[PDB]
Design a protein around this ligand. Structure first.
Ligand code: MG
Lengths: 17, 175, 175, 17, 175, 175, 17, 17
């Protein structure tokens, strides 16, 4: 299982623009 | 490029009928105290004789459960459950299109990086609500990796959905 | 020129008796996190002997339903439904004028353009509440056009309205 | 039917002052 | 000179027993989105064996009714009604002083003139709660004139008050 | 050095089963309008066929009672009571580890000294929730002195705790 | 009867300091 | 009994860093 949110507080990423 | 669902969908979610729509995040920041709310705009005359044009009425989106306070870091699918206290309780597939109404959706929060507060408004007219559809997922859980495809942000497919009014569906359920 | 109803009205809306008043928008901006709230100022002595002069009590305007969080882009008619838990439950047309009370109305929100927060307060004395009236509409839906007439912003007409106390009206209804 | 609010977010207008 | 009640009072208000305290305004401004809240600080060991020292618990002051959102323009007397769900439900006059507890009171709001936000905290220890007293009024309604006497802001007099626990008072009431 | 609990604990508190975690304060300031909230992240497929990956659902932490509005001046132990409406209602000790879920915890408030607003996010994966433990106290009440030991901020000990699902525990209780 | 609050929004006064 | 919070508003102290 991989996190959605990390202990420190940062999330897990996207790809757009 | 923008971040707010174009069309809205209605279909089943664990038996109950629901009005759904997606809501986009921000690339360059996290939103604090973010809150999603939704009004129902529609004229109606009181049996009393007074005609209120564009009367507004609030739409359950988790106020009571607190589920309207969003943790937005990835596109979310706001889901309104259509209950007795829903303005769509008595509306069925064939009934939908012939409704003179509109749904306004409002997103408020204080941006972190910018230290400013935002409000992103949007709407849906009767001819913009899609009955019997669900949103294409946009979050794949790759090998040790979660990723979104904003190319499918608006993409919606068709699903088997009864053409009955929420009220009627609950009436058959009793029998 | 200003934007906040002068007088308040009381009349029927789908059977129930309601205390109504209009609330104005801002020309130069949209208000975020806008909230309407209303207090009831009125002295009363507790049977207990203590006399509280200008005790205040909150007035239902959609707190529970969340309908007190306004989407203000056009003049709105805030409508208080007069129920068991209304301080006017026992007040009738002939009873009204002889009440030593006052209604304060408070509007809070964060302005967008100005990036500042506002609070517009206002009041209504017993001799400023109009029994048996409704607000003139100020939003016409012209051919592909919605428009307001702030010339009729305060304009109010008279409507057939029983001169009974909300409580009494509900007592007859039972019979 | 004409909108009250537009997709982008802007409303539909008044006449005063 | 300051604006926050020193002692707290407990006495009757329309039959029900209530814990009261005054809260001061600001001379140089109005407070927007003002909210009064109050916590109960007191150590307690769970029958379960775990001892929580200074556990905190919220204290009803109008959250549900919305009456905790203050319109502060004049000293107000916040009144907690002592009900089943009050931490004082079982506390009586003679029981009071021997309680190892404390009440924290917190006032939050955004100042208008200063465009800043405030938080005024304060407390009351068991030996600072006065049983059987009421606050001296500080708002006289002179001839076409309302006025406060901040000289009587803290002044409190003694009133006839039964020395029973809120629970007991309600038990006799049944008989 | 940081201020937010690492692991979470589950054990008994006055009969009821509870999910607990600590939350740290700020040395250099007090937080106004501080609010703790917690979401439950976990994928689930509707019997209806739609598979929602990482659907989120709110977690009771005092919203209804208002006990989610924190008075943070010292480390606090947020305690979720596991009831019918808890997503853990049916989860038991042996059931815990094999759950594909995650708990996000979010703390919002406006800092006083800095005049800015904060949001401290954090999470707990199934393998980070400790069943049958309680937090070591970190607040000793010395002779006329209250003091914290942030050396024990994360320290947790083991306590006797039944390995039954909250639902089951309540079912035996009936018998 | 005298007002507590005036239509414009201003209150009715005190005496302290 | 010693206070957790003082009338003026200040709390009672810690030891860290
Ligand atoms: Mg705010």
């Amino acid at each position: 299982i991989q996190r959605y949110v990390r202990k420190d507080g940062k999330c897990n990423v996207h790809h757009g623009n | 490029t923008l971040v707010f669902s174009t069309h809205a969908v209605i279909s089943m979610r664990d038996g109950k009928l629901c009005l759904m729509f997606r809501v986009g995040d921000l690339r360059n920041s996290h939103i604090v105290e973010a809150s999603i709310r939704a009004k129902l705009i529609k004229s109606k005359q009181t049996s009393e004789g007074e005609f209120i044009p564009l009367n507004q009425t609030d739409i359950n989106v988790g106020y009571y459960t607190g589920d309207d306070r969003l943790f937005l870091v990835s596109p979310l699918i706001i889901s309104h459950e259509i209950n007795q206290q829903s303005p769509f309780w008595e509306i069925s597939k064939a009934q939908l299109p012939k409704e003179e109404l509109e749904i306004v959706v409002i997103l408020e929060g204080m941006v972190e990086a910018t230290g400013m507060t935002c409000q992103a408004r949007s709407s849906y007219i009767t001819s913009e609500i899609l009955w019997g559809y669900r949103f294409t997922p946009v979050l794949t859980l790759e090998d040790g990796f979660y990723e979104v495809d904003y190319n499918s942000f608006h993409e919606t497919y068709e699903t088997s959905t009864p053409s009955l009014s929420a009220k009627e569906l609950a009436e058959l359920a009793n029998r």
